[PDB]
């Protein structure tokens, strides 16, 4: 009964990934983490390591601690940049350091034989975000789609160089055209259920392409189907 | 970065606990597992070990194999009975063995210093269930609220003897669901989002009462809040 682990590593978008009630409307929404645990049930444990407001610099400090303690991680997402790409302020991390920080994470994961997946920033509803975060905007701490695209492009390049999959959420979020993308966000930065569903489906696509043995449809469903269990339970594990 | 683990051990109702889309309407529902991971984020890992169709006898075989591996489990639910209480057939486990099996699980958990929580069966919408499971019903394999109640009562007794909390879902489903209780189930046995929400709230209540240090409100949220992190990150792990 040792399960392989799938690590989700990142910021608030990873920390918030299991909440079906992101708004106080009572109503339930799709949650990436919930879907992952469900589809990987009796297949792989989902290990959530998301830290709201964190950057690639701070995340780099914590990653070795995670990898030292946890056993049998076989695959992991890295999703940072929604904070790093802020134009100024304490969460800003310049592009060369950002890329090097992510590269170090990929290298460290590879050193544990962990299969990395890089996730790029999604879109920002700037009109909405800047209303709610007016105090930050007054200080000049902008989150723009232009800068998020710069960071996404650099992550695509890094992913290619390190030969790992990249999930381009900024493009995926644009899939229906028009103004449809605005529904993929709750507060203009964090993801709604609809946003998490696109994230999930694109994530699973790169898993099938790069790491098919760890796609839910190819993994062994652990232990006997109940209909096949002997009365005494002697065959459950073999 | 050592996280403690909260183990969820049981049958299909544990296996299915993270699915927000249990039915083909495409409409998301509350999921017990999702709420647990969310509220315990940066506090405790949720370790899911549910096995569809399993009984207390078969689960007793699995349990020592789980506990010998997994490090740092501090608390665990045990939720079996929805299959064991079947009136006949391959899933039926008689009450004396059922109680002894659950007792053995509790005593093994305690030897690992794991805090057990016993969950009782919820309601069965027999009218609906038997329409789907006609072939099983024809073999005489009934799941009845009367028999579920006998198993629930026996679990309450065992829980009291072993000084562990008991969650009486059958009663909680009646009190919260009222005349609408059937909507707490999907196929008449498995739980809907509404059923899982009752399960959740009752579970957290007994955790606060019996095991307060492991209720989310009392647990340390790990690592500095981002607003309190120094530029270089030197204080991220300071309070750990």
What is the DSSP secondary-structure string of B86-108?
SSSSTT---HHHHHHHHHHHHHH
Query: Which helix (H) or strand (E) covers residue B6, if one does?
Result: strand B4-10
Taking an 8 Å cut-off on Cβ atoms, the answer to whether A1 and B62 are in contact is: yes
Q: DSSP characters for B138-175?
A: HTT----HHHHHHHHHHHHHHHHHTT--EE-HHHHHHH
Q: What is the dihedral of CA B28, B30, B36, B42, to 10 degrees?
A: 40
The terminus-to-terminus CA distance of chain B in angstroms comes to 8
A12 counts as catalytic = yes
Which chain A residues have a beta carbon less than 8 Å from that of B232? 57
Q: Which neighbouring-strand residues pair with B48?
A: B8
| A114 φ, ψ (degrees, to nearest 5) | -85, 135
A-B contacts at Cβ under 8 angstroms = 141
The answer to whether the beta carbons of residues A88 and A142 sit under 8 Å apart is yes
The strand order across the sheet containing B4-10 reads B44-50, B4-10, B73-79, B115-119, B166-167
DSSP H or E stretch at residue A198: helix A193-210
User: Looking up tokens 């809040």, which residue turns up?
Assistant: B225
Instruction: Compute the distance between CA of residue B17 and CA of residue B20 in angstroms, rounded to an integer.
Output: 8
d(CA A3, CA B140): 37
Residues B72, B223: Cα–Cα separation, whole Å: 19
Phi, psi of A7 (to 5 degrees): -85, 130
Taking a C-beta distance cutoff of 8 angstroms, is the pair B22, A89 a contact?
no
- Residues of chain B found within 8 Å of residue A66, distances taken between Cβ atoms: 1
- B146, B194 Cβ separation under 8 angstroms: no
DSSP designation for A217: T
Residue in A closest to B60 by C-alpha: A233
Looking at the complex, report in whole angstroms how far the Cα of residue B227 sits from the nearest Cα belonging to chain A.
Answer: 8
Query: Which pair of tokens denotes residue B104?
Result: 């053995």
Angle CA(B129)–CA(B193)–CA(B38) in degrees, nearest 5? 145
* Rounded Cα gap, residues A50 and A25, in angstroms: 25
List domains and CATH numbers for chain B: 1-240 (3.40.50.1110)
Residue A219 in 3-state DSSP? Answer: coil
The DSSP H or E segment spanning B110 is helix B95-111
B-chain CB neighbours of A34 within 8 Å are 18-20, 31, 33-34, 37
Best CA proximity match to A58, nearest among A88, A82, A93, A103: A93
Q: Note whether A38 contacts B51, CB cutoff 8 Å.
A: no
A156's enclosing H/E stretch is helix A145-162
Q: Which residues of B are catalytic?
A: 12, 187, 190
Tokens of B55: 């009984």
CB-closest option in A34, A49, A237 to B65: A237
CA A145 to chain B, closest CA, distance in angstroms equals 23
DSSP state of B4: E
State how far the Cα of B189 lies from the Cα of A123, in Å rounded to an integer. 42
Which residues touch B181 (CB under 8 Å, ≥6 apart)? B123, B125, B173, B174
Helix B145-161, helix B95-111: angle, nearest 10: 40
Who contacts A82 (Cβ-Cβ below 8 Å, separation ≥6)?
A11, A12, A13, A121, A122, A143, A148, A189
Say whether A223 and B62 touch across the interface (CB within 8 A): yes
B118: closest CA of chain A, how far (Å): 22
Other C-beta atoms within 10 Å of B80: how many? Answer: 30
CB contact under 8 A, B225 and A53: yes
Residue B141 — φ and ψ, nearest 5°? -95, 80
Which of A56-72 are b and which e, b meaning 16 or more Cβ less than 10 Å from the residue's Cβ?
bbbbbbbbebbbeebee
Measured over all CA atoms, what is the biggest interatomic distance in chain B, rounded to whole angstroms? 69
Which chain B residues have a beta carbon less than 8 Å from that of A57? 232-233
Query: Closest to A47 (Cβ–Cβ): which among B45, B65, B232?
Result: B45
| HEC per residue, B33-91 | HHHHHHHCCCCEEEEEEECCCCCHHHHHHHHHHHHHHCCCEEEEEEECCCCCCCCCCCC
Resolution (A): 1.6
| Residue A48, min C-alpha distance to chain B (Å) | 8
* Phi–psi pair at B6, nearest 5 degrees: -110, 110
Q: Which residue of A has its CA nearest to B26?
A: A30
The reply to whether residue A61 touches residue B237, judged by beta carbons under 8 angstroms, is yes
Q: How far is A80 from chain B (nearest CA, A)?
A: 14
Distance CA A102, CA A211 (A): 20
Q: Please give the method by which this entry was determined.
A: X-ray
Contact between B141 and B91 under an 8 Å Cβ cutoff? The reply is: yes
Query: B15 vs A41: CB contact, 8 Å cut-off?
Result: yes
As beta bridge partners, residue B8 has B48, B77
Contact yes or no for B15 and A225 at CB 8 A: no
Ramachandran class of A84: left when φ > 0, alpha when ψ lies in -120 to 50, beta otherwise: alpha
Query: B100 and B57 in contact (C-beta within 8 Å)?
Result: no
DSSP states along A21-77? --STT------HHHHHHHHTTTTEEEEEEE-TT--HHHHHHHHHHHHHH---EEEEE
For tokens 């689960």, the residue is B59
Q: Is position A152 annotated as part of the catalytic site?
A: no
Rounded to an integer, what distance in angstroms lies between the CA atom of residue B62 and that of residue B64? Answer: 6
């Amino acid at each position: 009964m040792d399960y392989e682990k799938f690590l989700l590593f990142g910021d608030s978008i990873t920390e918030f990934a299991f909440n079906t009630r992101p708004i106080e409307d009572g109503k339930d929404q799709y949650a990436l983490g919930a879907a992952l645990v469900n589809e990987y049930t009796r297949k792989m444990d989902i290990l959530q390591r998301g830290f709201k407001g964190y950057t690639s610099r701070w995340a780099l400090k914590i990653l070795p601690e995670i990898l030292k303690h946890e056993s049998n991680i076989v695959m992991a997402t890295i999703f940072l940049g929604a904070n790093d790409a802020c134009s100024a302020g304490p969460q800003s991390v310049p592009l060369p350091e950002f890329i090097d920080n992510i590269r170090q994470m990929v290298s460290l994961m590879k050193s544990y034989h962990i299969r990395p997946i890089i996730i790029g920033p999604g879109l920002v509803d700037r009109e909405k975000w800047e209303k709610e975060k007016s105090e930050e905007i007054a200080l000049g701490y902008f989150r723009t789609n232009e800068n998020f695209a710069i960071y996404s492009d650099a992550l695509a390049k890094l992913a290619n160089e390190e030969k790992v999959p990249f999930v381009a959420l900024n493009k995926a979020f644009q899939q229906e055209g028009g103004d449809a993308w605005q529904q993929l966000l709750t507060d203009g930065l964090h993801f709604s259920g609809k946003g998490y569903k696109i994230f999930h489906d694109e994530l699973l696509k790169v898993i099938e392409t790069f790491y098919p043995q760890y796609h839910p449809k190819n993994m062994q469903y652990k232990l006997k189907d109940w209909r096949d269990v002997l009365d005494d339970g002697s065959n459950i594990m073999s």
